Specification:
part of a larger assembly, 2 chains, mainly alpha, 52% helix, 0% strand, ligase, Complex, Fanconi anemia group A protein
Chain lengths: 50, 50
């Protein structure tokens, strides 16, 4: 669904969307351990979302 | 090592100077362990002088 209400609502609405969950069942995208490691390595502590 | 050697020499001159040492003796200025802790906690992991 396109409607650009906000960011949080868009993210969660895409999250609950069916076809999106269907895509995640073929494991080229399941975010393996090492992948997550790399992605969290890229972030710095100076800037801070968490 | 650190930025301008002039500030370093100023700090050393003040540190070695006598009346500095005689002031250092009588005790509330003596950096309680808790105060050291408070200050080292105040600083961050982001801007790290060391």
């Amino acid at each position: 669904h396109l409607p650009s209400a906000d960011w949080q609502r868009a993210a969660l609405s895409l999250w609950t969307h069916r076809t999106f969950r269907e895509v995640l069942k073929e494991e080229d995208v399941h975010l393996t351990y090492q992948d997550w490691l790399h992605l969290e390595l890229e972030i710095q502590p100076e800037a801070d979302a968490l």
